[PDB]
C-alpha cells in the first residue's frame, strides 16, 4: 500500500481525457474595441496561416454572430472551424497535440491570445460554465472599474505560471464612444426638440433602418444616410449639416458638443452580478496542477478588493463537483460491498477480510496509470469503482475454495 | 484624412498607420502604455 | 442603372460590380480600399 504513495504523487488531474474530434475550433481573444473592418482582416490573415499547416484541409473563419439566438458573438470575437485531414494523412510522427503546437506557433498576431479547442468539447463547456477555455477565472463585483482592475492583475500573474500559453481577461469598459451631448438651450433657439436633433444621429450619421421592401417571400432593409464623407470623423460630425425646421442652415456643433469617451464595451452579467472572465490556455501540463499553481500565484500577488470576488470556473468547477460526489460515494460502495459479503457467507470477521482486499487492486491501477502516463479523472475514477467490485468478486471466489 | 498635432512628435519620426489596433493592444498588455504614463 | 465616366478608366478595363465589399456600417472606405493593395 505504501508503494502506491509514489505514482500517486506523480500523476496529474483532469476532468476528462482530451477526446480527439476529427477537427477543432480556433478562438482567439483580444481587447474590447476592435472594429469589424479590422477584425475581419484579422480573420483572413489568421485563416491563411491555419491553412498553411499540412494537416488542415479546410478553414471556416467566423467573426461576429450567425443569424440565430444560439450565437451572441461580437464582431470582435472569432470562431473559426478548422477541419483536419484524415488521420491516415498526417505527417510521420504527427499527433494531435503536435498539430496544435504548430498551429499555436504559426498562427499568431500581436495582441491576440490564441485558443484551440475541439468543437463539441467547447460547445458543452460554454453551456456549463460559460468559459470557452478549459481553465477560467471569474472576477465578480458591482464596480466594473474594480473588477476590471482585478482581472488585469490576475491576467498577468497567470502568464508567469509555468504551463500557461496565453491568458487574456475580457475588459468590461474598453469600449469607445463618440458622444453627441445635445444642448437643449442651443437647439431650442432653432425651434428643435431633442428628438429633432437626434434624427440626424440615427439617420443622417448612423444608418438606421427606415422600412423594408417586400419581394415575394423575402424582405430587404431600406435606409437613409448622408454620404460617409459628412460622418467620417468627430470634426466631421461637428460640421454635420442640419436644415432646421425654420429652414436655417446650421451644423451639428451649433446644437451639440461631441466628445470622445471610454465606457462599457459589453455588460456581462451572471445571476445579475457583473463579471469578467479570464481565458487561460495551458496544454503542456495537466489541468489540476496548473490551476493549483494559479491559485497560489493569484493568492500571494493579488490583494482582493472589498466588492471583488475571484473564482475558478471552467472544467475545474466540474471536477470539484464530481470529487465531492465521489468522496461521498466511496462509503456507499463500501457499505453495499460490505453487506453482499455479509450475506453470502454470513460471517462478520470473514467479510471484512474480502472487502479489505480491494486496497490491493487500487495500487494496481494507479501504477498502470502512471506507467501508461495517464491523469486522474472521472474517467479513471469510474474505472476504480468498477475495478473494486471485481477485486471483491474475486475476493469471494478465493474464499469459496 | 489627416490630423494636425499641436505638439507631441518630431518631423522625421515614424508612426504606424496600418495594423495600429492590434499593435497598440500588445503595447497595452506588455505594460508599455502604463510605462509611457509613469514616465511623465 | 449605369453611370458614365468623364475620366479615370480606359475602354475595356475590367471592373468589379460591387460596393458590397466594404461593410456599410462604417468600414472606413478609404482605409478599406487600402487593405486591398501593397
Amino acid at each position: 500500500v505504501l508503494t502506491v504513495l509514489w505514482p500517486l504523487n506523480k500523476v496529474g488531474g483532469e476532468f476528462l481525457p482530451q477526446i480527439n474530434e476529427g477537427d477543432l475550433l480556433y478562438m482567439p481573444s483580444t481587447l474590447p474595441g476592435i472594429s469589424a473592418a479590422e477584425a475581419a482582416s484579422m480573420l483572413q490573415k489568421t485563416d491563411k496561416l491555419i491553412m498553411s499547416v499540412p494537416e488542415v484541409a479546410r478553414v471556416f473563419g467566423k467573426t461576429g454572430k450567425a443569424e440565430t439566438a444560439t450565437d451572441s458573438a461580437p464582431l470582435e470575437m472569432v470562431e473559426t472551424t478548422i477541419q483536419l485531414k484524415p488521420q491516415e494523412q498526417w505527417r510521420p510522427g504527427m499527433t494531435m497535440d503536435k498539430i496544435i503546437e504548430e498551429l499555436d506557433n504559426t498562427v499568431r498576431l500581436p495582441g491576440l491570445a490564441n485558443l484551440w479547442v475541439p468543437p463539441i468539447r467547447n460547445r458543452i463547456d460554454m453551456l456549463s460554465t460559460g468559459i470557452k477555455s478549459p481553465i477560467g477565472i471569474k472576477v465578480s463585483g458591482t464596480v466594473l472599474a474594480d473588477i476590471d482592475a482585478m482581472a488585469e492583475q490576475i491576467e498577468e500573474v497567470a502568464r508567469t505560471v509555468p504551463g500557461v500559453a496565453s491568458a487574456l481577461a475580457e475588459r468590461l469598459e474598453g469600449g469607445r464612444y463618440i458622444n453627441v451631448e445635445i444642448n437643449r438651450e442651443k437647439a431650442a433657439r432653432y425651434g428643435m426638440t431633442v428628438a429633432d436633433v437626434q434624427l440626424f444621429v440615427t439617420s443622417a450619421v448612423g444608418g438606421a433602418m427606415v422600412g423594408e421592401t417586400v419581394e415575394g417571400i423575402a424582405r430587404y432593409p431600406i435606409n437613409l444616410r448622408y454620404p460617409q464623407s459628412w460622418r467620417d470623423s468627430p470634426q466631421a460630425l461637428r460640421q454635420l449639416p442640419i436644415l432646421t425646421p425654420m429652414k436655417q442652415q446650421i451644423t451639428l456643433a451649433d446644437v451639440a458638443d461631441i466628445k470622445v469617451s471610454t465606457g462599457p464595451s459589453m455588460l456581462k452579467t451572471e445571476n445579475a452580478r457583473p463579471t469578467s472572465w479570464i481565458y487561460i490556455d495551458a496544454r503542456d501540463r495537466d489541468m489540476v496542477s496548473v490551476v493549483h499553481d494559479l491559485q497560489k500565484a493569484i493568492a500571494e500577488k493579488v490583494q482582493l478588493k472589498p466588492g471583488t470576488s475571484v473564482a475558478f470556473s471552467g472544467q475545474f468547477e466540474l471536477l470539484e463537483r464530481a470529487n465531492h460526489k465521489l468522496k461521498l460515494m466511496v462509503p456507499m460502495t463500501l457499505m453495499i460491498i460490505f453487506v453482499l459479503l455479509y450475506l453470502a457467507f454470513r460471517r462478520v470477521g470473514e467479510a471484512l477480510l474480502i472487502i479489505s482486499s480491494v486496497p490491493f487492486a487500487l495500487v494496481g491501477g494507479i501504477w498502470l496509470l502512471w506507467w501508461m502516463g495517464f491523469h486522474l479523472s472521472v474517467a479513471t475514477g469510474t474505472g476504480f469503482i468498477a475495478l473494486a467490485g471485481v477485486a471483491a468478486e474475486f475476493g469471494v471466489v478465493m474464499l469459496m475454495y | 484624412g489627416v490630423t494636425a498635432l499641436r505638439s507631441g512628435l518630431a518631423e522625421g519620426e515614424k508612426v504606424v498607420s496600418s495594423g495600429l489596433f492590434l499593435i497598440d493592444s500588445e503595447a497595452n498588455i506588455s505594460g508599455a502604455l502604463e510605462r509611457m504614463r509613469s514616465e511623465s | 442603372g449605369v453611370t458614365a465616366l468623364r475620366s479615370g478608366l480606359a475602354e475595356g478595363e475590367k471592373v468589379v460590380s460591387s460596393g458590397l465589399f466594404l461593410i456599410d456600417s462604417e468600414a472606413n472606405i478609404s482605409g478599406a480600399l487600402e487593405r486591398m493593395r501593397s
Binding site: 500581436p110 | 508612426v15 504606424v16 498607420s17 495594423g19 508599455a32 | 487600402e34 487593405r35
Partner: peptide, 26 residues
C-alpha cells in the same frame, strides 16, 4: 525600457504599414 518588441514575422503577417511625421499646414 519603454516600448514593446514584436516578432517581425507577425507584424509582417499583420501587414503593418507606417507613415512619417511631417510639419506643414493642414
Amino acid at each position: 525600457a519603454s516600448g514593446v518588441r514584436i516578432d517581425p514575422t507577425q507584424t509582417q503577417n499583420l501587414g503593418v504599414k507606417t507613415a512619417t511625421v511631417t510639419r506643414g499646414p493642414l
